[PDB]
């Protein structure tokens, strides 16, 4: 719970969490997350297949 008087204000204080609990795929609508890892190729369930109708 460390806190510094250099900014009595909480304004400049730049609080930034980091996490890797579970794993999700990145995107453009996603910043450069610290974790550039976990290339766990999880299946996509359905498959475009040629049926007959």
């Amino acid at each position, epitope marked *: 719970s460390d*806190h*510094t*008087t*250099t900014c*009595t204000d909480v304004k400049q204080c730049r609080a930034y969490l980091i996490d890797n609990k579970k794993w999700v795929y990145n995107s453009g609508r996603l910043p450069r997350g610290e974790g550039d890892t976990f290339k766990g190729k999880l299946h996509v369930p359905f498959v475009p297949v040629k049926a007959k109708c």
Partner: antibody, heavy 120, light 107 residues
């Protein structure tokens, strides 16, 4: 190097404007804060401010605030701590913290006030 | 502010590395409290012997040296000598008020 030593315990009866003249030595009083702490010989650095002389905003500290107007002169290096209208609370060695950007940490061989008068 | 209920003294008989522990009742007597491990005599060395209870400030002969060793801001009485004998109260000049350490009298 923080020798912002307050003026000696000055007998200026309560209600008078004492001056805990913490004439700072070379301690970057312009480039770092010089707080005033009107404190007893062993009370602890009861700062009148986390006085950011370097910073824009001096984070005022209640412990010595109140009739101990910190006349801190950043350029002049003198936390003069002029106890304007000093009530009966100047009689305590007004250590002057080097409140570098409002980090009131130092002190000095500070004198005091003495909001009392004694017959000669 | 952070009331610094200082540990009373730095125990030393022979010149040795003592620690003028100066506890804070509310929190750790720290740099935010600006304990500054001060070894304040009345007139003599009445200044921050520590520097925000982290490094040896003005009034230290390395005996009021800045050190928050616990919630006690130990004015580190390293090689505490007879001249090191001072009320090394890690005098907090905290951000809200003083709340300074009462006394950690090195001797």
């Amino acid at each position: 190097q923080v020798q912002l030593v307050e003026s000696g315990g000055g007998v200026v009866q309560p209600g008078r404007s004492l001056r805990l003249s913490c004439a700072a030595s070379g301690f970057t009083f312009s480039n770092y804060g010089i707080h005033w702490v009107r404190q007893a010989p062993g009370k602890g650095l009861e700062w009148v401010a986390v006085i950011s002389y370097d910073g824009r905003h001096k984070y005022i500290a209640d412990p010595v605030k109140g009739r101990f107007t910190i006349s801190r002169d950043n350029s002049k290096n003198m936390l003069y701590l002029q106890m304007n209208s000093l009530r009966t609370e100047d009689t305590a060695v007004y250590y002057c913290a080097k409140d570098t950007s409002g980090w009131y940490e130092f002190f000095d061989s500070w004198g005091q006030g003495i909001p009392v008068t004694v017959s000669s | 502010e952070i009331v610094m209920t200082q540990s009373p003294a730095t125990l030393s008989v022979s010149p040795g590395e003592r620690a003028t522990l100066s506890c804070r009742a509310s929190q750790s007597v720290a740099t935010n409290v600006a304990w500054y491990q001060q070894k304040p005599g009345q007139a003599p060395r009445l200044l921050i012997y520590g520097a925000s209870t982290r490094a040896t400030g003005i009034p230290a002969r390395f005996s009021g040296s800045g050190s928050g060793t616990e919630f006690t801001l130990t004015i580190s009485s390293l090689q505490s000598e007879d001249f090191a004998v001072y009320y090394c109260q890690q005098c907090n000049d905290w951000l809200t008020f003083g709340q300074g350490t009462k006394v950690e009298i090195k001797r």
